[PDB]
């Protein structure tokens, strides 16, 4: 079975330029390759079949290149509705094999954090635990890190993120981290903290609350 | 013209079984052959297998025969895909896709057209209720000139709960965040900015509504 890689999962492109993405085999596929573009989220299309034909009303700004184990997909000036994954194909053997995906993302001005932490709340307390949330809003880029920090030294193993895909709208990622505590294990320990590492900062943002100041 | 329709999304329970549709339109349906292909969540692609409608019969990935089984109906135009023994590491969506004209064994196959794709839901699970909580700003942090604020959504069994912020009105500076299923329970949660000094005067309060347990919660911050 042919191992199809994509070495790359994600790919930063502002809009006009150049990009390439790369295909690998794990073994000589007699140019029998294909490119399938799948929009976010939605349906699949074939761009480019045998290396580098090019499926019909797929626009010029595609091109496909390759030999024997390694290939390659050109878009030329990066326009916006290229911002999708792209999958490579053999057709050589059998079964007809994929690589795990490649997605563009768009490049855009560095944009800081807003993040903010709440405390846990009076019903869910009555409901027998108690979950702290950070939510950090609208960064970019998406390298982003995150601690819980309790009473100086820190605490996973109860936390639980959630990331959302670039926003559509402003080119952003915002991302909810939730610890989830017991309400004794939430009795003990008056600080709380959220903490947040990016680009756009050589300090740490830090967000805390006192459980004993509530 | 070449179009495919397939069937509509289904929850279903482990070791059951289920049979979707790909009505073609648009080509003559036994001259192409069709393919299923899976995608799970966070991995590429993966063939399932083929199978050509013009006589000559098909072929299939081995490692999902058994578990599959593709069939035709020549006559309404629709392929058809039977799993069996659904387990969850079968939810996936689910496309046909057609393979140009000519063959298969080598090329001549490659997918020039895709259908929107079925999702497949595997769960034992019943339908749960959704337990809203009112994130509210914390005690010592120092008065911004912009508040967010949120409600977290817990609980939920299945999948689909919508939150409102004003009921519809703050439509900006609102994040919906992916909901994230731990122990058969889905959760999710969801933020909204208002300048400071619009809150806590003018009132925030979110909506929940999850439509299968036939709830319709609202929290005020």
């Known amino acids: 079975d042919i191992q199809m890689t994509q070495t790359t999962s994600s790919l930063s492109a502002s809009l006009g330029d150049r990009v390439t993405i790369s295909c690998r085999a794990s073994?000589?596929?007699?140019?029998?390759l294909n490119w399938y573009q799948q929009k976010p989220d939605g349906t699949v299309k074939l761009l480019i079949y045998?290396?580098?034909r090019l499926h019909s009303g797929v626009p010029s700004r595609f091109s496909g290149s390759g030999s024997g184990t390694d290939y390659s997909l050109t878009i030329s000036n990066l326009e916006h509705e290229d911002i999708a994954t792209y999958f490579c194909?053999?057709?050589?053997?059998?079964?007809?094999?994929f690589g795990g995906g490649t997605k563009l993302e768009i490049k855009r001005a560095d944009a800081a954090p807003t993040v903010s932490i709440f405390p846990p709340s009076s019903e869910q307390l009555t409901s027998g635990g108690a979950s702290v949330v950070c939510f950090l809003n609208n960064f970019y880029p998406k390298d982003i890190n995150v601690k819980w920090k309790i009473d100086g030294s820190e605490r996973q193993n109860g936390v639980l993120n959630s990331w959302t895909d670039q926003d559509s709208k402003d080119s952003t990622y915002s991302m909810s981290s939730t610890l989830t505590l017991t309400k004794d294990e939430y009795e003990r320990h008056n600080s709380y903290t959220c903490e947040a590492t990016h680009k756009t900062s050589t300090s740490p943002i830090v967000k805390s609350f006192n459980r004993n100041e509530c | 013209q070449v179009q495919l329709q397939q069937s509509g999304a289904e929850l279903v329970r482990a070791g059951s079984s289920v049979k979707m549709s790909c009505k073609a339109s648009?080509?003559?349906?036994?001259?192409?052959?069709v393919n299923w292909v899976k995608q799970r969540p966070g991995q590429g692609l993966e063939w399932i297998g083929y199978?050509?409608?013009?006589?000559?019969?098909?072929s299939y990935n081995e490692k999902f025969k058994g578990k599959t089984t593709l069939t035709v109906d020549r006559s309404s135009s629709t392929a058809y895909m039977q799993l069996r023994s659904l387990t969850s590491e079968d939810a996936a969506v689910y496309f046909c896709?057609?393979?140009?004209?000519?063959?298969?064994?080598?090329?001549?196959?490659?997918?020039?057209?895709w259908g929107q794709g079925t999702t497949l839901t595997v769960s034992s699970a019943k339908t749960t209720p959704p337990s809203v909580y009112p994130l509210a700003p914390g005690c010592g942090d120092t008065t911004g000139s912009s508040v967010t604020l949120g409600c977290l959504v817990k609980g939920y069994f299945p999948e689909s709960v919508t939150v409102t912020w004003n009921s519809g009105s703050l439509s900006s500076s609102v994040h919906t965040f992916p909901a994230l299923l731990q122990s058969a329970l889905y959760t999710m949660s969801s933020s909204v900015t208002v300048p400071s000094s619009t809150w806590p005067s003018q009132t925030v309060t979110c909506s929940v509504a999850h439509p299968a347990s036939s709830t319709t919660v609202d929290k005020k911050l």
């Open positions: 073994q000589d596929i007699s140019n029998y």
């Open positions: 648009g080509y003559t349906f036994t001259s192409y052959g």
């Open positions: 194909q053999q057709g050589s053997t059998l079964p007809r094999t």
């Open positions: 199978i050509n409608p013009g006589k000559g019969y098909l």
């Open positions: 896709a057609r393979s140009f004209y000519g063959g298969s064994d080598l090329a001549v196959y490659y997918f020039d057209s």
């Open positions: 045998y290396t580098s």
